[PDB]
Write a protein that binds this ligand. Sequence first.
Ligand SMILES: Nc1ncnc2c1ncn2[C@@H]1O[C@H](COP(=O)(O)OP(=O)(O)O)[C@@H](O)[C@H]1O
Ligand SMILES: [Mg+2]
Ligand code: NA
Ligand code: NA
Ligand code: NA
Length: 379
Amino acid sequence: AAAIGIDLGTTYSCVGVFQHGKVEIIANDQGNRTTPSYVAFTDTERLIGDAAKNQVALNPQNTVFDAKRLIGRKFGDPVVQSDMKHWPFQVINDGDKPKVQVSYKGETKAFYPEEISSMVLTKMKEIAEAYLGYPVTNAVITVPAYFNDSQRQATKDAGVIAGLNVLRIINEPTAAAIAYGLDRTGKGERNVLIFDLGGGTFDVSILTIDDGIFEVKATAGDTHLGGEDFDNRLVNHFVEEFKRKHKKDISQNKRAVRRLRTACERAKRTLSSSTQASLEIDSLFEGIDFYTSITRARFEELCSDLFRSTLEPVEKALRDAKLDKAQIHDLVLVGGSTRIPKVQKLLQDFFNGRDLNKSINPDEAVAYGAAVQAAILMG
Ligand SMILES: Nc1ncnc2c1ncn2[C@@H]1O[C@H](COP(=O)(O)OP(=O)(O)O)[C@@H](O)[C@H]1O
Ligand SMILES: [Mg+2]
Ligand code: NA
Ligand code: NA
Ligand code: NA
């Protein structure tokens, strides 16, 4: 009866299980290997993952996400107060602690972030239970290296609320290191850089691994830099193309903007594999179709600054670790936004044409490690 590895992500989560000497990442019911960290509440049902993200445009007050920015923090924490302005769902104080308040089945109900995160974790558990054919009771769960003790504690609580014994809370970069087998080089000291660009957050972590033992030498990043911000540049481009091509400002209508956001996301992903993408939105604003397109290089210009800003934290982590570019043994790409060729290319130029570790899908890499370490901990 195997234990599972879970990446409980800001924007996407992923579950894996080690079976027969190899890691298996479990696709969700729509066949996706990651699941958005979205919970939605309606008059009749509670929805998690893809089904929850797919109705966001029609249910903004009761469709919850970004729980991981609240988890284990105080309500009066300035990070939470600032984040609250950007969400359409309500956050309330409940003696010092934030809760998310929504309508659900014709009533007002309020939930701690770890309750929200436990619903996400429950989805990940169920998907693994149908894949294996038995109940799952054990898991490793990942968290970012910067998480304080309370953020860890609340995430581990999220696990126990989902009916899991959490075997260990481990750092995301460590799990990605373990993915790539970097704890199983023996008597020998190796320097690893984890470059983690996801949906909401960019984290750079430098690790030193000695006899398979892990030391964190530096972390740096930007908790508000990720895939969504690139989506948002695409939105603003297409908003303005709409104001030229049909003479109307859609920026005020939340539904339009949020459906456009979704189409931009899909178009972004297509641009990692093709040099151009089409955007086809039936009845975007006041009956009017929006059909258009954009090149990769045009996308790259729109994001120029954001992509180039991923380098300042790499440099910073290297100074804080007191190493140079050259003394990194392994460069590991993690996070779904590292699929973007310009991001990969900038990093390569900066590390003097070094070949990059991407054999493991970067959006799965954390869960990959998590699953290996889960199985190790079961014995
Ligand atoms: N092929 C792709 N090209 C560009 N971005 C991608 C691709 N696939 C996924 N992404 C982006 O990666 C982000 C998801 O990152 P992921 O690492 O899976 O979750 P998290 O960052 O929350 O841990 C989203 O912004 C998503 O749009
Ligand atoms: Mg991640
Ligand atoms: Na993730
Ligand atoms: Na990230
Ligand atoms: Na992220």
